[PDB]
């Protein structure tokens, strides 16, 4: 049994980024991993001693989930040359990996693109509304992605978006979503938490895309799907590397083309979801894998 510790930036009950690592880690138990998870460690002064403690106790693999945990991972890695570490970040992380650290990245714009593409693939949805949080560069990039994905799959659809200015302000998110609904949105896309948007959607009988998996049953019932990271192949590769003695300096991109970004199991909502939605997304992924389709940089 390989002993694995996951050190998460936020809360694994978020039904989103941190839950994605927790779910991959749960599935990794079938590959012979014994897993411990610690949450809420975005603060590097808190993360570094926890990481050190797992390494000192003889864990085989210590995984820092989220860019905020990356620097502590890289620092402690230098102390334990025979322990294996993982960190996440931007493309520049590849440069900065000690011999015993694997790194990974993904592009926010691609999550947006898949949401928008799914939105444009639906039946009878000509008006789409999206609600995000603060207008930070990665959020604006995500939204530029949505617009592009939607234009690709349905160039006739119209699109409006609203920003709450905040992370995880469900009350403002709900209000923003209701405003788009009142103006005529036939689908609501969440780029932040989504639980507030989900409430507004239920009140107006419209489907959603992107809402947190931690939402209640009534809200989950209207969420067609959500674009997410599948970390399981990456984690499986870590175990294989450790078993073969080849761990270190791998740099993985999780993307649509390689199924690092995928959909959650699709829910049919109303009659807007085509029977072949998954096939359409699979074909999109194949076009990206081949380079038939190339996506712009969605950042300014
Ligand atoms: Br986080
Ligand atoms: Br969850
Ligand atoms: Br994310
Ligand atoms: Br376990
Ligand atoms: Br354990
Ligand atoms: Br433990
Ligand atoms: Br914890
Ligand atoms: Br320390
Ligand atoms: Br983070
Ligand atoms: Br990250
Ligand atoms: Br060591
Ligand atoms: Br991007
Ligand atoms: Br940013
Ligand atoms: Br566009
Ligand atoms: Br707009
Ligand atoms: Br706005
Ligand atoms: Br803002
Ligand atoms: Br709130
Ligand atoms: Br509402
Ligand atoms: Br909820
Ligand atoms: Br190794
Ligand atoms: Br790609």
């Amino acid at each position: 049994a390989v002993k694995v510790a996951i050190i998460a930036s936020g809360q694994t009950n978020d039904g989103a980024f941190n839950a994605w690592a927790a779910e991959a880690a749960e599935r990794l138990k079938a590959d012979g991993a014994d897993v411990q998870i610690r949450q809420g460690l975005a603060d590097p002064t808190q993360a570094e001693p926890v990481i050190r403690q797992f390494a000192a106790r003889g864990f085989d693999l210590v995984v820092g989930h989220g860019i905020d945990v990356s620097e502590p991972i890289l620092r402690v890695a230098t102390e334990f040359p025979d322990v294996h570490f993982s960190a996440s970040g931007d493309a520049t992380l590849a440069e900065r990996l000690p011999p015993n650290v694997d790194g990974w990245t993904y592009d926010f714009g691609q999550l947006g693109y898949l949401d928008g593409f799914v939105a444009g693939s639906l039946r009878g949805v000509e008006k789409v509304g999206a609600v995000g949080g603060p207008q930070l560069p990665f959020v604006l990039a995500t939204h530029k992605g949505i617009r592009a994905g939607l234009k690709a799959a349905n160039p006739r659809a119209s699109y409006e978006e609203t920003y709450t200015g905040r992370f995880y302000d469900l009350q403002k998110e709900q209000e923003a979503a209701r405003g788009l609904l009142d103006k005529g949105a036939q689908l609501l896309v969440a780029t932040d938490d989504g639980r507030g948007l989900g409430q507004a959607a239920v009140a107006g009988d419209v489907p959603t895309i992107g809402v947190s998996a931690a939402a209640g049953a009534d809200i989950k019932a209207v969420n067609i799907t959500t674009a997410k990271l599948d970390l399981l192949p990456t984690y499986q590769s870590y175990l294989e590397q450790i078993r073969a003695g080849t761990f270190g300096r791998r740099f993985d991109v999780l993307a649509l083309g390689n199924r690092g970004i995928v959909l959650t199991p699709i829910t049919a909502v109303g009659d807007v979801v085509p029977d072949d939605l998954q096939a359409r997304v699979d074909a999109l992924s194949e076009r990206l894998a081949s380079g038939e389709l190339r996506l712009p940089n969605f950042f300014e």
Side-chain angles (χ1 to χ4, degrees), residues 147-164:
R147 196 184 283 269
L150 179 61
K151 185 182 174 179
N154 186 354
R156 287 276 176 170
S158 67
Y159 176 84
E160 197 184 338
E161 72 199 345
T162 298
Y163 295 103
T164 69

Side-chain angles (χ1 to χ4, degrees), residues 107-121 138-154 159 189-191 209 225-227 255-257 261-263 280-281 283-285 287-288 292-298:
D107 287 333
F108 288 104
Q110 287 202 10
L111 297 171
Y113 194 90
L114 180 57
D115 293 330
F117 185 88
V118 169
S121 296
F138 77 98
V139 178
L140 294 175
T142 302
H143 282 245
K144 197 168 182 187
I146 293 175
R147 196 184 283 269
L150 179 61
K151 185 182 174 179
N154 186 354
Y159 176 84
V189 187
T191 61
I209 291 169
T225 189
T226 289
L256 291 163
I261 295 171
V262 296
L263 293 180
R280 299 196 203 188
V281 168
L284 165 69
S285 176
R287 295 199 299 284
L288 289 163
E292 191 187 336
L293 177 58
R294 290 173 68 185
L295 297 170
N297 180 352
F298 292 114

